[PDB]
Structures are given as structure tokens and as C-alpha cells.
RNA sequence: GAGGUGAAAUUCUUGGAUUUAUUGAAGACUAACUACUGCGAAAGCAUUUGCCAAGGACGUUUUCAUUAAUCAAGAACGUAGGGAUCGGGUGGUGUUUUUUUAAU
């Protein structure tokens, strides 16, 4: 509701489709109009736009998914690796977030992608091999590594990026 | 993306159109300068090939569109179109008045292989199918009726009717010759040891030689004009 | 029958509501006692015939 | 076998180019009334059509032809009991119902189709206490009406079938039987008011009932449907049988 | 008048599957994978690989005659990622673009109730 | 994959080139039971109608998982897809019957959140016919109005009471009904409101659903009863002309 | 836990304002009331 | 073609591997709900329903009358204050509730 004024003009006047914010089942439904809407994949791109926004990325990040259509959005969980009982789960999300978001922002600025993370399920959006680089760095950090070592590894991956 | 190559020394793409549906059946006339093509929705465009663009639209139909045929004698004033179908029907159009002549809903599968001729406007036609029914009609210009059905046991693909009045059928790699006005298979080729069947019959030299392109990537010659005056 | 259902419901809801509040505030007995009524019970006749049935 | 006792075609052997021995048997056995037809699926089978009828079963005509072709061309088949009290059932004034069989229930199915139209219309409206379950109980719905229900037949006493409807289990129903039956009349008045409001092609009229005794105020409504049938609506409540047990 | 297939888009690890079936589930139509388009063995789970795979499936299914596709995305399930990867959205974007009407996007990934 | 990878000793077995089966396949269309509206749900490939594993018996076992919004034309229930078992093939139209029902998983995964407790129930119940159903029911605690505490937890001795009364009343709602009546009373979602009305006395109980009906044993065929669920029909002549 | 206590203070504030607003504030339907 | 990885490779696969659908069997586990919440002497304990006993807190104008605690040996099992919440009880008086079926 607070970002609805910036969401719909890239769904109406920039991108050609039409929106409804259904308060029936608390959802968003998107139609494409047959009379004048071009771009036969624009419905899917706008759906994935609001899907990334409701999934947890910020609205400029979701606009970055809307434009430049080759950015996809991977999702995985903490619970798949090492089974992570709740105290260790708190250690895990605190270790990924660092202090004042600094390790997460380090991965963000390093691997040219943007992540968000819920209490047990995290999401990375970007380009596909950058998703894979961020995912292997995150799964190494959630296996539990020195942050200096993962900083050096991300220096090497940024050297691969350049 | 429809294209046409003039086969002569100018082998360039002469005309190129943007058709609606991805199509899978084309037929040009017995004469030149008429090309009919129908997509996989109901739309049968026909095109004058010289100055290549759409001359008729023919929304008309329903379902994806099976094989079709022209009715062409040089310097006539009739110019019909056959227009088979997947859900079994034959909806004959003309080309001089852009009207559905007769709607015919009688079949049960894809109407492959239909053919139009006149015998003294009489204009008998014959429409096979993936069902085993060839189902010839009288087809007057104003109002039409039916005659015999004569039921070959095949899955007929391109039933090129009206040879010298004798019909053909293919579809089990079996080229059945069937008499008209009564039913008897009289010439029929050897069934092979594969399972692959007839994709297409092709008339050469005014319905006297027959090319047979198979489901396999082979193509055979028949010589009907000798092997009908010949058994097997 | 529309005016009949109007008049019949109009007198019935009135007598039902006054019987309900009459059993909901019937505190005084003549010798000191306070009648236990139970929650949202609608009639003194109802609790009377209930306590006759529970014999 | 009463399932396919009156099936109007008899599918014999399938058709091929090589005429099999059972096909030859069927040809020589039936002859002038055999044919080979395509059915709607696409297969071809030798069969024999039979013009069915209401005053006979088709097995009469079949045994007639299949004896007058084989045992003797003068052996007369005589039966009259079936023809006498096979049409003691009243012949329903329908399209071609003399030509149809007696195991056909298409009048009942047409009545249930009109009932499904009324069912959808009575659901997707709005009430202060909406319908929990509407369900028919009538004689045409159990296929035991004497005459088959033809549309617009007023004078048959088995015309107005009864459908009942139960509302949601709400506690705000009144106490005694005259007031809860009067509330049932209130709900019926509401649904006929909205029915004449939104769907003018139907019609409604009320009716007093007297079969349940000592409450003269039980009212049903009767819907006259544009398809040609009528329905008698009875409201059931959860308070009813415990009211009667209280009494 | 349209007719409907069912996508069953499998967004696996190291591979991606797309094969539309008629909506019973028996008669599958044009099984492709991510491997049978690209030639590297490293990105047979590529978004591009799934993209042209879904393009070829769309062409073959328009050749057969189905026009709309009820789409059902399945991840690898089990005690594994339980959630679609990038190949699922890649195939979804591809066959949503390629002239094919789309219906009822879902998620049919299996959930374990705490298996091993 | 490509040309540079491997031969892998499995490609030496030769390929049996082409059979082109879609020229041989055949289209049928499905007719849903007449409890719903819009009974035409789509089309199905089968095989060519020959002998020796014919079409009409290679059929008649399958299920189709259609959406209830596709059956009713009303987007108020886009979830709750049902499964129809194709049972009696009769003249190009697959007459089907009810076989099951399930929520699309996004609806229940968006219904369940934390700071509330959910209740499950499930009974094996025979209908008035000889079908038996493992019919399920899901329930959720309502945050009461004018509440303050974040919790809204059930005392787990209310949970036995809610589960007992919900199993009792939906056992009654099954056993006083046939299967067609069970579908026609499950479609306009009325045992949910019946559960909420008969169970709001003990606890406030946010949105109730049933979410699963699994058939476990079917009585018999009864071709006439299945034709009675749709409408009658008598396959008759087509002209011989030979 | 500070966020929990803050959310409880927000809910108590909302309920006190809602109670303050609450304190400061045809024939057939008359028969078909009370349901 | 499937698998598998940073790439591979091994393996499986035209006697149809992967995938799809309908089932059937087998054992183990109880996704989300799950919290700075519950229980048990401790280790530990999460599907439903029933049985078998036990235990804790509360309630109490009920009884007994010092029966208490502490541990070798042995034995069984393995400084003051405030807010919120869980279980029980008392009082208040609004909405949920409802009314002669029981319950509370």
C-alpha cells in the first residue's frame, strides 16, 4: 500500500497491461488488454515484477527485474543443509547478515546481485551465474567460515567479475 | 513467415507475408497464380502468386485445418475451394463470391485428402479422412446432396480421387484403387514390412504417374497408367 | 400475509424481549432469596418446566 | 437382461475387407434388415436398427422377424397381455413418446434440468440467513410419478413436486412453532420477492398446507418455471423436531 | 474455442524438463530436456537452454493442435530445495511469450512431512 | 547434447527412426457430471480405435485435474481443483464422475502463518452409496476482535472438543448424502459455514476448509446411474450407402 | 522483545481509540431482522 | 539422453534410462503450526483416537498431628522495581455467545 503509487505506472503507462488490487483474497491480478497492449511477454514480466516485490525485494529491485528481462530469482532454505537447530539457525542468519547488514551488502555489491532473507528462506535475484556465485558463497558462509576468508573469496570472485 | 521463390534465374525471395497461424497445409491451383494456405486456427488465406498478397481471408472455419484442394480449369468462372478440417467437416468455399457454399458436418476425425471434379454444373467431390470413410458428394452449385460412402479399410491420406472414375487411397503404404458407383478394391500395392505409411500422393503428367512420399524419407513411382491396364 | 407476518412478529418480539429481561432481572424473592437464572435463558416458564422435567 | 433389454440397435460383427465367417453368418441370418453402419466413434459394424415403441418391447418384433424368416413364413406369433397392460401406463403427451420406449426417463431428466436451473438461481441470490442445503424429495425426483411429467400439466395432483430447503444452523430462530413457521413464511416471502425482482421469467404463488395438522400457518410457495414445471418449496429448520419433542 | 494441455515444467538441478501432456496425464507430447538443445554439459540447466527448449515444445504443440497450457511448475522435491530454480521461470517466460495461451500457474513440488 | 561429449555405449543401439504418432492419435472430449455447470472441460488424446487393446478399454481409468474456476466460471474459488475419473466412454464423449478434490498448495501455504494454531480432522466415512471417503478438514484460530494478546492459542483440550464436533458433524453430512449430493453441497462451500456456526460456541475459529476428499473404494459401475447423472442417450443408425 | 512490547502498546492504543469512537457514537425485512 | 560436479568421469539407457499418469507393497519420520511457549527427576518429549495407571498447579471452614531436612553405603532410570506470557481461582460487565437436549 505504501509503494502502490510507484508500482502501477510501470504496469500501465510504461508497460502495457492493467492491474487490480483484489481485497477479496488479498492478491493482485493482472490482465492484458487486447486492444492496444503490445509485448506478448509483458504479462509474465509484470507478474514476476510484483512477485519479486511481494516476495521481499525492494521496489527499485523489482523494477530492475521488470526492465532488463534476463534477471531471474532463485530461492532456497536454511533447512536443507546441516539441518540447523534453532540456536544454530540464529547463528546462521546473524552470520549471513553480519553486523548492520554489512556482510549481506558485501555479497550484494560484490556479485552484482541483490538478496533478501526471511527467517529460514532466502532469495537472490540477478543474472544466472551471479546467482550461482552468490549461492555458493552463501552456502559456504552458512556451513560456517571466517568472514575474512569469505571476503578474500569474494575479492577473487570480483576479480572474475572484472 | 510465408515466402515465395521464383524458380527461374531470379531465385530471390519475390514476396514474403506474415501469416497468422503456423500453417501445415498448402495447395496451389491446377493452373498457376492461386495459392491457398490455412493455419492451425480457422483461417484459410488464398493468395494470387504473381503480385503476391492476400486475395481472400476466409475466417469461416473451426479448429485446425486439414488438407484442402482447388477446382481449377483454365479460363473458367467457378473457382471453388475444398477446405477440410480436423474435427470432421468439409466447408466448401468458392472464390468468385467469397461465400460458404455448403456446410457439411458428417465425419469423425481429421478430413485429409479431398478432391473435386465434374462429370456431366455437376461437380462431384470426395473427402477421405483419418476415419475410414471417403464419402463422395454430388455438390451442385445451389443445393447439394449425398451419394454412396464405399468405405475403404485404411487410414486414408490424400485420397486422390477420379482417375481413369476410379479413386486412389494411401495410408498404410497401401495404394488402393477403388471403383466408383460400387465398391471393390481392384489394384492395391504390396504392404511392406515396416509400420510407416503414406504421407503423400503426387500426380505427374495429368494423373498418369504417381509419386508416393512415405512416412519414411523415401519416394516411389507407381505408373498407374500401365498398372491399371494390367492384379497387384 | 405480509401484514400478518409484520403484526405477528411485531407483537411476538416484544413479548419475547420483555419475558427475557423479566427472567434476567428477577432477583427478589419474598424471603431474601436470589433466583439463579443461568446465562441467556429467556423465560421463567422455561426454567420452571426444565426443573420440573429434571425430577 | 433388463439393462440392454430395449437397446434399439444390435451391434453384430465388425467390418473388414476379408468377410469373416461370423459376418457371413450374420448376413445369412438377418439378410434384408441387416446393414453395416458407422457409429459415432468411427468403427464400422454390421447391425440392425429397430423402430422402438411404447406399446411393445422390441424383442417382440425381433422374435417375430427372426421366426418368420427361419422356422416358418406362416407361423403366427400371438401375444396380447404385454400389449394390453403395457399401455395401461398413461401415454405422456410428449414429442414422439409413443415411439419412445418405456425405460426412457427423459421426462424426469428434463424436470431435473429445470430443477437445476431453479437450483442455481436460488443459490446465487442473497438471504439474511443463506441456504444450507436445498434438496428435492418429490415423486418425479424418485421416478415414481404416475404420469410422466409433461410441461404445463396443471391438473395432475402429482404436478407440484416438493423440494425442501434447510438454512444454516442459526440459534436466532424463535421458540414456539407458530412463530418459527411464520418466520419460515417470512423467508419464503423474501425469496419470492427477490425472484420476481431479478428473474421475471419464473413466477411464484403461495399455498397453505394442511397435511401436518394443528398448525394452519404452514405455508409453502410454488414456483411455476418457464420450462413448464412447478415446485413446492418447504423450509426445514433444526428447531422443528426438538419443538415437536418439546410438545 | 481453445483446447488445453498441461505443462509439467520440471525445474531440476543440473537439468530442466518441459513436456506438455493432454490434461489426463497419460499421452505426453514432445518431451524435451535442457540437455538436448545446448552442447556443453555444463549449462544443461541453463535459462537459455530451457528457453529454446520451451520454444521447441511450443512449436510442436501448436503443430499438434493444443493452444492453451495449464502450467504446473515442479521443483525436485524430496528432502531437497523444494522450490523452483531459475530454469522454471525461464521456461515459463519462454512459453508465455511464444504465442501460447497460459492458464492456472501452480506449484506441485512434493512436501515431505519430515522424511529422512 | 553435442558432438564432442561422448558416445557412452548406449547410442550404438540404433534408433528406430520415426513412428509419427499424432497422425494416429484420436481426440475425445470430456463431459463432466451435471452437478456442475459447463460440463465440457477439454479434450484428450488416446490412440487409434482399432482392435487388440482397443480405445474404449485403454480408456476409462484415467483422471483429469480440472480447476473449479474452470468448471464454475466464478473466480471466487480459483483454488480447490478437483479430479474427475473418466469412467464410461460413449460416442466420442468421455462421461466422467467425481474422484477427488484438493487445494492448490499456494492457498493453504498462504493461509497458514505463525501466532495462530490450526486444527486438522479426517474421517473414513461411507456414503449412502458404497463409496468410502477419507474426507479431510482444516481449521484455524481466529484472532478475536478487541483482543490484545498476540497469541490466540487453543488450550489443546479445546482442540479435542473442536476435532470431535467437526468429525461428528461432517460424518453426519457425508452419511446423510450420496456422492452427487456431496459434490453439490461441497461446491457452494456450505459445510465450512456449518462447521463455523456449530463450532463458534467453543472458539472463534478463522476460515474453515475441507481441502481433500479421497475415494478409497468404489461400489460397481452402474452404467445406467452414470448416464442418469448426465442425461440419457441412445446411439443409433448412420447410413450404410454400400 | 522490544518489538513485541511496542506492538502490544500499539494494539492497546488502537483498542482504546476504537472504544472511544464506539462510546461517542421494509416490512418483510422488519420481520426478517435478528438473523 | 538421464545422472553427477568447479569441470569432468564412473554408472543407467531403444530389453525404452529421466519425466508423466494410475495404483500396490515396505519400513522410518511426524513438513508449515514452532514461540525466548508446554511437560518430565534427568536424558528427552511434537499425527489422530481409545485404554491403562501416574503427576503438577489451583481450589478447600476435609483429615492426620512433627510424620521434616541433609547426605556416605545402597538402589532405579539414563539489593529492589515493572511489563508480558502459561496453568488455576475470584470479581466486574460489553461483544462474541445464544434459546427446554446435556455440557459450561
UniProtKB/Swiss-Prot annotation, chain C:
Compartments it resides in: Nucleus, Nucleolus
Oligomeric form and interacting partners: Component of the 90S pre-ribosomal particle.
Family: Belongs to the RRP7 family.
Note: Present with 2610 molecules/cell in log phase SD medium.
Function according to Swiss-Prot or TrEMBL: Plays an important role in the synthesis of 18S rRNA but is not required for the 5.8S and 25S pathway. Is necessary for the cleavage at site A2. Is required for efficient association of RPS27 with the pre-ribosomal particle.
Protein name: Ribosomal RNA-processing protein 7
Species name: Saccharomyces cerevisiae (strain ATCC 204508 / S288c) (Baker's yeast)
Gene expressing this chain: RRP7
Shown chain mapped onto the complete sequence: 180 to 234 of 297
UniProtKB/Swiss-Prot annotation, chain D:
Organism domain of life: Eukaryota
Protein location: Nucleus, Nucleolus
Family: Belongs to the NRAP family.
Functional description taken from the UniProt entry: Involved in nucleolar processing of pre-18S ribosomal RNA and ribosome assembly.
Oligomer and partners: Interacts with snoRNA U3. Interacts with MPP10. Component of the ribosomal small subunit (SSU) processome composed of at least 40 protein subunits and snoRNA U3. Interacts with UBP10.
Record's miscellaneous remark: Present with 3260 molecules/cell in log phase SD medium.
Full protein name: U3 small nucleolar RNA-associated protein 22
Organism: Saccharomyces cerevisiae (strain ATCC 204508 / S288c) (Baker's yeast)
Span within the parent record: 620 to 866 of 1237
From Swiss-Prot, chain E:
Keywords (A to Z) from UniProt: Acetylation, Cytoplasm, Nucleus, Ribonucleoprotein, Ribosomal protein, Ribosome biogenesis, rRNA processing
CC annotations in GO: 90S preribosome; cytosol; cytosolic small ribosomal subunit; nucleolus; nucleoplasm; small-subunit processome
UniProt keyword Oxidoreductase, yes or no: no
Post-translational modification: N-terminally acetylated by acetyltransferase NatA.
Location of the protein in the cell: Cytoplasm; Nucleus, Nucleolus
GO molecular function terms listed in the Swiss-Prot or TrEMBL record: mRNA binding; structural constituent of ribosome
One Gene Ontology biological process: maturation of SSU-rRNA from tricistronic rRNA transcript (SSU-rRNA, 5.8S rRNA, LSU-rRNA)
Family: Belongs to the universal ribosomal protein uS11 family.
Entry function: Component of the ribosome, a large ribonucleoprotein complex responsible for the synthesis of proteins in the cell. The small ribosomal subunit (SSU) binds messenger RNAs (mRNAs) and translates the encoded message by selecting cognate aminoacyl-transfer RNA (tRNA) molecules. The large subunit (LSU) contains the ribosomal catalytic site termed the peptidyl transferase center (PTC), which catalyzes the formation of peptide bonds, thereby polymerizing the amino acids delivered by tRNAs into a polypeptide chain.
Note: Present with 29600 molecules/cell in log phase SD medium. There are 2 genes for uS11 in yeast.
Record's protein name: Small ribosomal subunit protein uS11A
The encoding gene: RPS14A
Residues of the full protein shown: 11 to 126 of 137
From Swiss-Prot, chain F:
Gene Ontology cellular-component terms listed: 90S preribosome; cytosol; cytosolic small ribosomal subunit
This protein's name: Small ribosomal subunit protein eS1A
UniProt lineage: Eukaryota, Fungi, Dikarya, Ascomycota, Saccharomycotina
Amino acid composition bias (Basic residues), ranges on this chain: 1-16
GO MF annotation terms: structural constituent of ribosome
Keywords linked to the UniProt accession: Acetylation, Cytoplasm, Isopeptide bond, Phosphoprotein, Ribonucleoprotein, Ribosomal protein, Ubl conjugation
Note, other: Present with 92400 molecules/cell in log phase SD medium.
InterPro entries hit by this protein: Ribosomal_eS1 (IPR001593), Ribosomal_eS1_CS (IPR018281), Ribosomal_eS1_euk (IPR027500)
Source organism: Saccharomyces cerevisiae (strain ATCC 204508 / S288c)
Posttranslational mods: N-terminally acetylated by acetyltransferase NatA.
Amino acid at each position: 500500500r505504501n509503494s502502490w503509487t510507484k508500482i502501477y505506472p510501470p504496469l500501465v503507462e510504461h508497460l502495457k497491461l492493467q492491474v487490480r488490487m483484489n481485497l477479496k483474497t488479498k492478491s493482485v491480478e493482472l490482465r492484458t488488454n487486447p486492444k492496444f497492449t503490445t509485448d506478448p511477454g509483458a504479462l509474465q514480466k509484470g507478474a514476476d515484477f510484483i512477485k519479486a516485490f511481494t516476495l521481499g525485494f525492494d521496489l527499485d529491485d523489482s523494477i530492475a527485474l521488470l526492465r532488463l528481462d534476463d534477471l531471474y530469482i532463485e530461492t532456497f532454505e536454511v533447512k536443507d543443509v546441516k539441518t540447523l537447530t534453532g540456536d544454530h539457525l540464529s547463528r546462521a542468519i546473524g552470520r549471513i547478515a553480519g553486523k548492520d547488514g554489512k556482510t549481506k551488502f558485501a555479497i550484494e555489491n560484490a556479485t552484482r546481485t541483490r538478496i533478501v532473507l526471511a527467517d529460514s528462506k532466502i532469495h537472490i535475484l540477478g543474472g544466472f551465474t551471479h546467482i550461482r556465485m552468490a549461492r555458493e558463497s552463501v552456502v559456504s558462509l552458512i556451513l560456517g567460515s571466517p568472514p575474512g576468508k569469505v571476503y578474500g573469496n569474494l575479492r577473487t570472485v570480483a576479480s572474475r567479475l572484472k | 513467415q510465408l515466402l515465395k521463390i521464383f524458380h527461374l534465374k531470379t531465385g530471390k525471395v519475390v514476396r514474403s507475408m506474415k501469416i497468422s497461424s503456423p500453417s501445415y497445409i498448402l495447395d496451389a491451383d491446377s493452373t498457376s497464380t492461386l495459392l491457398a494456405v490455412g493455419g492451425t486456427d480457422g483461417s484459410i488465406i488464398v493468395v494470387d502468386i504473381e503480385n503476391g498478397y492476400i486475395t481472400h481471408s476466409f475466417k469461416g472455419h473451426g479448429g485446425t485445418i486439414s488438407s484442402l484442394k482447388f477446382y481449377g480449369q483454365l479460363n473458367s468462372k467457378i473457382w471453388l475451394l475444398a477446405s477440410g478440417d480436423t474435427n470432421g467437416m468439409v466447408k466448401v468455399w468458392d472464390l468468385v463470391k467469397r461465400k460458404c457454399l455448403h456446410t457439411l458436418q458428417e465425419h469423425t476425425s481429421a478430413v485429409r485428402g479431398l478432391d473435386i471434379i465434374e462429370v456431366p454444373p455437376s461437380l462431384n467431390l470426395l473427402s477421405g479422412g483419418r476415419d475410414d470413410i471417403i464419402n463422395l458428394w454430388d455438390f451442385n452449385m445451389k443445393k447439394k446432396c449425398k451419394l454412396l460412402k464405399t468405405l475403404p479399410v485404411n487410414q486414408q491420406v490424400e485420397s486422390c480421387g477420379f482417375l481413369k472414375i476410379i479413386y486412389t487411397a494411401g495410408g498404410d503404404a497401401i495404394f488402393q484403387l477403388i471403383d466408383s458407383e460400387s465398391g471393390s478394391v481392384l489394384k492395391r500395392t504390396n504392404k511392406p514390412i515396416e509400420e510407416l505409411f503414406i504421407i503423400g500422393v503426387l500426380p505427374i503428367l495429368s494423373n498418369s504417374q504417381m509419386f508416393l512420399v512415405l512416412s519414411d524419407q523415401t519416394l516411389q513411382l507407381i505408373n498407374v497408367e500401365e498398372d491399371l491396364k494390367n492384379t497387384i | 400475509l405480509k401484514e400478518d407476518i409484520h403484526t405477528h412478529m411485531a407483537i411476538f418480539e416484544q413479548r419475547e424481549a420483555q419475558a427475557q429481561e423479566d427472567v434476567q432481572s428477577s432477583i427478589v424473592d419474598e424471603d431474601g432469596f436470589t433466583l439463579v437464572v443461568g446465562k441467556n435463558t429467556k423465560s421463567l416458564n422455561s426454567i420452571r418446566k426444565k426443573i420440573l422435567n429434571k425430577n | 437382461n433388463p439393462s440392454e433389454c430395449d437397446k434399439l440397435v444390435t451391434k453384430g460383427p465388425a467390418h473388414s475387407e476379408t468377410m469373416s465367417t461370423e459376418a457371413a453368418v450374420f448376413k445369412n441370418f438377418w439378410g434384408i434388415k441387416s446393414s453395416l453402419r458407422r457409429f459415432k466413434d468411427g468403427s464400422i459394424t454390421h447391425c440392425c436398427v429397430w423402430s422402438t415403441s411404447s406399446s411393445e418391447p422390441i424383442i417382440s418384433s425381433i422374435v417375430n422377424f427372426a421366426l418368420q424368416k427361419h422356422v416358418s413364413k406362416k407361423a403366427q406369433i400371438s401375444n396380447e397381455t404385454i400389449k394390453k397392460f403395457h399401455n395401461f401406463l398413461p401415454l405422456p403427451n410428449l414429442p414422439s413418446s409413443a415411439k419412445t420406449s418405456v425405460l426412457n426417463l427423459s421426462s424426469f431428466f428434463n424436470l431435473k434440468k429445470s430443477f437445476d436451473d431453479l437450483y442455481k438461481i436460488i443459490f446465487q441470490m442473497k438471504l439474511p440467513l443463506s441456504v444450507k442445503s436445498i434438496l428435492p424429495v418429490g415423486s418425479a425426483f424418485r421416478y415414481t410419478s404416475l404420469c410422466q411429467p409433461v410441461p404445463f400439466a396443471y391438473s395432475d395432483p402429482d404436478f407440484f413436486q416438493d423440494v425442501i430447503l434447510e438454512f444454516e444452523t442459526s440459534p436466532k430462530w424463535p421458540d414456539e412453532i407458530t412463530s418459527l413457521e411464520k418466520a419460515k413464511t417470512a423467508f419464503l416471502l423474501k425469496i419470492q420477492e427477490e425472484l420476481s425482482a431479478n428473474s421475471s421469467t419464473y413466477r411464484s404463488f403461495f399455498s397453505r398446507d394442511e397435511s401436518i395438522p394443528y398448525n394452519l400457518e404452514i405455508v409453502t410457495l410454488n414456483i411455476l418455471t418457464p420450462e413448464g414445471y412447478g415446485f413446492k418449496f418447504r423450509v426445514l429448520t433444526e428447531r422443528d423436531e426438538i419443538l415437536y419433542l418439546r410438545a | 474455442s481453445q483446447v488445453f494441455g498441461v505443462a509439467r515444467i520440471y525445474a531440476s538441478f543440473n537439468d530442466t524438463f518441459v513436456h506438455v501432456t493432454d490434461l489426463s496425464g497419460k499421452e505426453t507430447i514432445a518431451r524435451v530436456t535442457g540437455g538436448m538443445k545446448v552442447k556443453a554439459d555444463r549449462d544443461e540447466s541453463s535459462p537459455y537452454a530451457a528457453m529454446l527448449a520451451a520454444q521447441d515444445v511450443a512449436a510442436k504443440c501448436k503443430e499438434v493442435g493444443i493452444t492453451a497450457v495449464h502450467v504446473k511448475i515442479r521443483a525436485t522435491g524430496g528432502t531437497r530445495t523444494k522450490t523452483p530454480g531459475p530454469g522454471g521461470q525461464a521456461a515459463l517466460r519462454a512459453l508465455a511469450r511464444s504465442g501460447l495461451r497460459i492458464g492456472r500457474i501452480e506449484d506441485v513440488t512434493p512436501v515431505p512431512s519430515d522424511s529422512t | 547434447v553435442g558432438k564432442n561429449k561422448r558416445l557412452s555405449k548406449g547410442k550404438k543401439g540404433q534408433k528406430k527412426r520415426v513412428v509419427d504418432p499424432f497422425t494416429r492419435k484420436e481426440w475425445f472430449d470430456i463431459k463432466a457430471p451435471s452437478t456442475f455447470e459447463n460440463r465440457n472441460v477439454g479434450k484428450t488424446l488416446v490412440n487409434k480405435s482399432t482392435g487388440l487393446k482397443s480405445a474404449s478399454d485403454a480408456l476409462k481409468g484415467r483422471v483429469v485435474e480440472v480447476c473449479l474456476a474452470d468448471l464454475q466460471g466464478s473466480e471466487d474459488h480459483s483454488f480447490r481443483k478437483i479430479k474427475l475419473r473418466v469412467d464410461e466412454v460413449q460416442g466420442k464423449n468421455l462421461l466422467t464422475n467425481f474422484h477427488g478434490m484438493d487445494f492448490t498448495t499456494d492457498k493453504l501455504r498462504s493461509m497458514v502463518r505463525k501466532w495462530q494454531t490450526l486444527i486438522e480432522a479426517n474421517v473414513t466415512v461411507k456414503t449412502s452409496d458404497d463409496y468410502v471417503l477419507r474426507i479431510f478438514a482444516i481449521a484455524f484460530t481466529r484472532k478475536q476482535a478487541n483482543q490484545v494478546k498476540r497469541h490466540s492459542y487453543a488450550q489443546s483440550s479445546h482442540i479435542r472438543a473442536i476435532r470431535k464436533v467437526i468429525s461428528e458433524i461432517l460424518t453426519k453430512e457425508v452419511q446423510g448424502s450420496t456422492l452427487a449430493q456431496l459434490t453439490s453441497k461441497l461446491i457452494p462451500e456450505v459445510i465450512n459455514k456449518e462447521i463455523e456456526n456449530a463450532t463458534k460456541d467453543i472458539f472463534p475459529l478463522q476460515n474453515i476448509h475441507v481441502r481433500k476428499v479421497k475415494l478409497l473404494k468404489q461400489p460397481k459401475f452402474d452404467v445406467g446411474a452414470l448416464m442418469a447423472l448426465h442425461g440419457e442417450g441412445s446411439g443409433e443408425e448412420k447410413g450404410k450407402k454400400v | 522483545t522490544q518489538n513485541v512490547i511496542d506492538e502490544r502498546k500499539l494494539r492497546v492504543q488502537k483498542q482504546l481509540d476504537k472504544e472511544k469512537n464506539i462510546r461517542k457514537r421494509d416490512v418483510i425485512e422488519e420481520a426478517l431482522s435478528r438473523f
